[PDB]
Design a protein around this ligand. Structure first.
Ligand SMILES: [Zn+2]
Lengths: 32, 39, 287, 548, 40
């Protein structure tokens, strides 16, 4: 396939975006 | 100073397990504590 | 029967009563009475606690005067609002928490009155911030221990959540009494009015902090910070040498310049910048 | 006929009694296992654990010998284990109208009248278990007995079984005695009322009833009444994607930890299988900010429910949370794996669950064993080698004296989970169509909450789904097809108990034949038989097999 | 037009993958040392 090669590849940019904010929250929570 | 912070946090890697103490020594601590409680 | 899912609710005031009266006469086992609404078969909500004065000198639990609690029970009746006695307490001071043989007797005098009375132990030494340590108890029948039968018939994953202490396990622990998981009731009406009032400066940062001795104290840190930096010109040079674990055990007799240095850098930094900015706002604000 | 067609396809009995036919014909279980777990005789949870385990491994097969072996160790534990005993019978007789009243003819509440109103009270629970999603005489028969009865010692069983039979049906009739069941001002009616109050209104978003429920759960003092409704107001909204977010925002805005937890659930149900950015930001943030542990545990157990569509992503996010500072997040993390990847033998998820039994906390050792059971049902040594690596492990922990009853409780439960239905039933939160199986979703969601009620997670029968083809040519007539497979015949392995006191790949299969969903692609079509299927055999279930 | 249109989406996105993934790898170990300090 060629069409899924971009849809599923931006899909993990949406999915990937959350985790840096997540560990950004844990970075202060484990301090506190 | 801040660049000497940003380009030096690499080190923390490789090593990955910080064990609590053990499992079998926790069980033996439960047995010896059970014997002190029985005593 | 019970399901070891009893879940005592208490208060936000009675903890303060327990630590104050448990702390004032602390090496003697002080006691008093508990007073709240008795809700359903599972839970109980003890809203108030008043203490009882002692009988005489001696580390024990003395006795209870129903003249005194008859009157004190009626003072709040004709002044505040009626409640019900539900439990009682004493104070193992620096012991932890269990039931002594004296404790189980005066408990046994109270469970015959109401079958769901509550034994409570406060420990006002080993508590620091997150460890208050209370662990309210109640008797189990030794008759069923003679039967060899297991009481209390767990229907909920709520009981076996806190592991019991080894000292109470040495004591009557599971052969004469049981633990009860508790928690607390609070509200923002209280949370704000204790948060906003505990540590509050007033106009103090709008001052100048001993304006001659600020620079003098700044001198009074930098002067020994010089020789401490000379020790930092001493301690680096034994690297490319013996292993850093020996450079860890070996440094337990004499001070290091590193941590002691970065302490004073912080102290000079935050000591200066606050006096600078707070010095400069008043130039704008006052004329 | 076309006149009979509404009964054939809308009552749908010829999958009910025909999967029941597959259960009564196909039964591969063991006595020796419950002989091995028989040895743990003590008056702990163990009685309820065993008598819920045989119901777990004998769903709908009507096999009364693991109960009928004795009466003494059966009825030894009392006062709720007899309630669990009359609970466990309907799962054994699930999906069968006839042997419901006649076998419980001892167990009607007005026949023998013993001192146990639980043994005779919780029957209608099991009648609702048999006739879940089949509303008939179960409604009014299980309703007029609830018009006049005792207190909430039969009303739990009739209420839960009644709303279970009327699950997702929007019925004013059960809603009436659920109104007066709601306004009892009783603590013990809370699980009776708040559960079925949502069950009959599944996916209805009846905002007047929402206003009644959350308007009622703001003033009472008991907590079970604040908990059954905390499930029900989640249950009333289902798959909405935007249509609850003001209410989720309200419940999370409230100071009540139980109600914030209920919001967690509600956002867990309005986003089933949908990988939405809107849910995942706050949802994950609620398990990091909040101070109660319960809302953190439900907050991390929302993730497999919102992300079971792609099971490749939950091991990527939750393994980061297997090492939290609290065993609560370490616990709901493992149950988040156990709800996400349970359909597959995810080698990575088993790899995550390997050290999860090592932790010094008893309940995370427990839920490690529950998730370890859910990951590998109907999987024999060739999907993953860890199966018999863990079969010895459940025995290893159940035969210790020095463990906890809670610690071995996940093992004794995990037995009847692991060998359920004689390797003939399975979990499926998912049809092959892409549509999810919402009674299985309700069954696993309700199955989470065994913390606060033990036969609450007895509601698991709706998750047990077949892996079996059915060949058929008429409405009733069995054909006789014998097709085979092509691929490796060691995939077709069995439990094969040991009972201590040249390789054929042509697996000839009849019409009621079990087949792994991985084995749906490795089979052979019948090309030489007189019968040839007009449908392309990709799904199992039931098909037409055209006589050529 | 799918060559010069569609394939140009792939060469772009991967550059964001390669450094946001790397920032993630730095950041989660940066959690992990502190977490081991906490439980220890
Ligand atoms: Zn004492």
């Amino acid at each position: 396939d060629l069409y899924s090669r971009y849809k599923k590849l931006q899909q993990e940019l949406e999915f990937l975006e959350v985790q840096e904010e997540y560990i950004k929250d844990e970075q202060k929570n484990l301090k506190k | 100073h801040n660049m000497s912070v940003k380009a030096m946090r690499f080190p923390p890697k490789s090593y990955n397990k910080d064990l609590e103490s053990a499992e079998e020594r926790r069980e033996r601590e439960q047995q010896d504590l059970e014997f002190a409680k029985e005593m | 029967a019970v399901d070891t899912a009893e879940q005592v609710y208490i208060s936000s005031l009675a903890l303060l009563k327990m630590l104050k009266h448990g702390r004032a006469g602390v090496p003697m086992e002080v006691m008093g009475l508990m007073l709240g609404e008795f809700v359903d078969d599972y839970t109980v909500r003890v809203i108030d606690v008043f203490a009882m004065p002692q009988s005489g000198t001696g580390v024990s639990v003395e006795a209870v005067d129903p003249v005194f609690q008859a009157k004190m029970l009626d003072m709040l009746k004709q002044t505040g609002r009626p409640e019900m006695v539900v439990g009682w307490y004493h104070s193992h001071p620096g012991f932890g928490c269990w039931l002594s043989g004296v404790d189980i007797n005066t408990q046994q005098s109270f469970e015959a009155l109401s079958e769901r009375a509550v034994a409570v132990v406060v420990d006002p030494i080993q508590s620091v911030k997150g460890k208050v340590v209370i662990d309210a108890f109640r008797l189990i029948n030794a008759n069923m221990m003679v039967l060899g039968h297991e009481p209390r018939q767990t229907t909920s994953n709520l009981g076996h959540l806190n592991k019991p202490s080894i000292q109470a396990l040495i004591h009557g622990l599971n052969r004469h009494y049981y633990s009860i998981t508790i928690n607390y009731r609070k509200n923002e009406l209280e949370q704000k009015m204790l948060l906003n009032l505990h540590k509050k400066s007033w106009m103090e940062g709008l001052t100048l902090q001993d304006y001659s001795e600020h620079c003098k104290h700044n001198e009074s840190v930098v002067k020994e910070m010089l020789e401490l930096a000379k020790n930092y010109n001493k301690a680096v040079e034994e690297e490319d040498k013996m292993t850093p674990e020996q450079l860890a055990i070996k440094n337990v007799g004499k001070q290091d310049p590193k941590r002691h240095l970065e302490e004073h850098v912080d102290v000079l930094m935050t000591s200066n910048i606050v006096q600078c900015l707070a010095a400069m706002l008043d130039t704008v604000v006052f004329k | 006929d076309q006149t009979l067609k509404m009964i054939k396809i809308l009552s749908g009995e010829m999958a009910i009694e025909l999967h029941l036919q597959f259960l009564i014909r196909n039964n591969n279980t063991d006595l020796m296992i419950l002989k091995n777990t028989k040895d743990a005789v003590r008056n702990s949870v163990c009685h309820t654990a065993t008598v819920i385990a045989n119901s777990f491994m004998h769903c709908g097969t009507t096999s009364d010998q693991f109960l009928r072996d004795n009466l003494e160790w059966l009825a030894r534990a009392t006062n709720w284990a007899k309630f669990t005993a009359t609970a466990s019978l309907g799962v054994i007789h699930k999906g069968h109208e006839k042997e419901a009243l006649q076998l419980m003819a001892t167990y009607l509440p007005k026949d023998t009248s013993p001192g146990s109103a639980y043994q005779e009270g919780g029957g209608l629970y099991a009648l609702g278990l048999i006739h879940a999603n089949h509303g008939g005489d179960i409604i009014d028969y299980l309703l007029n007995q609830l018009k006049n009865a005792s207190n909430d010692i039969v009303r739990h069983g009739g209420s839960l079984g009644l709303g279970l039979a009327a699950m997702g049906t929007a019925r004013q009739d059960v809603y009436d005695l659920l109104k007066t069941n709601l306004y009892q001002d009783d603590a013990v009616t809370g699980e009776a009322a708040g559960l079925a109050l949502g069950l009959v209104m599944l996916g209805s978003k009846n905002a007047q009833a929402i206003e009644d429920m959350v308007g009622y759960a703001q003033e009472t003092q008991h907590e079970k009444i604040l908990r059954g409704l905390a499930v029900g107001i989640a249950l009333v909204m289902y798959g909405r994607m935007e249509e609850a977010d003001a209410l989720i925002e309200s419940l999370c805005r409230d100071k009540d930890p139980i109600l914030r937890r209920s919001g967690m659930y509600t956002v867990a149900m309005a986003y089933c299988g949908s990988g939405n950015n809107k849910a995942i930001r706050r949802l994950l943030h609620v398990a990091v900010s909040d101070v109660n542990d319960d809302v953190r545990r439900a907050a991390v157990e929302s993730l497999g429910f919102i992300l079971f569509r792609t099971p490749e992503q939950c091991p990527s996010v939750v393994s980061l949370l297997s090492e939290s500072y609290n065993p609560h997040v370490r616990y709901g993390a493992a149950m988040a794996l156990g709800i996400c990847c349970a359909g597959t033998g995810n080698k990575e998820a088993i790899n995550l669950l390997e050290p999860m039994t090592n932790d010094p906390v008893n309940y995370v050792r427990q839920g490690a064993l529950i998730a370890s059971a859910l990951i590998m049902i109907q999987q024999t040594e060739i999907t993953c080698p860890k199966v018999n690596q863990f079969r010895q492990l459940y025995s290893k922990v159940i035969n210790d004296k020095h463990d906890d009853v809670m610690a071995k409780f996940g093992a004794i439960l995990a037995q009847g989970i692991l060998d359920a239905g004689g390797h003939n039933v399975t979990i499926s939160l998912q049809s092959r169509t892409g549509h999810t199986h919402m009674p299985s979703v309700v069954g696993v969601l309700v199955f989470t909450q065994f913390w606060f009620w033990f036969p609450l997670s007895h509601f698991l029968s709706l998750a047990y789904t077949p892996t079996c083809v059915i060949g058929l040519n008429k409405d009733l007539k069995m054909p006789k097809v014998q097709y085979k497979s092509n691929c490796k015949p060691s995939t077709f392995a069995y439990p094969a108990p040991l009972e201590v006191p040249p390789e054929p790949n042509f697996q000839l299969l009849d019409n009621p034949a079990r087949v792994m969903p991985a084995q749906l692609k490795v089979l052979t079509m019948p090309e030489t038989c007189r019968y040839q299927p007009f449908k392309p055999l990709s799904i199992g279930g039931i098909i037409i097999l055209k006589d050529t | 037009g799918l060559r010069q249109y569609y394939l140009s989406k792939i060469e772009e996105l991967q550059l964001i993958v390669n450094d946001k993934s790397q920032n993630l790898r730095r950041l989660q170990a940066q959690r992990n040392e502190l977490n081991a300090k906490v439980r220890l």
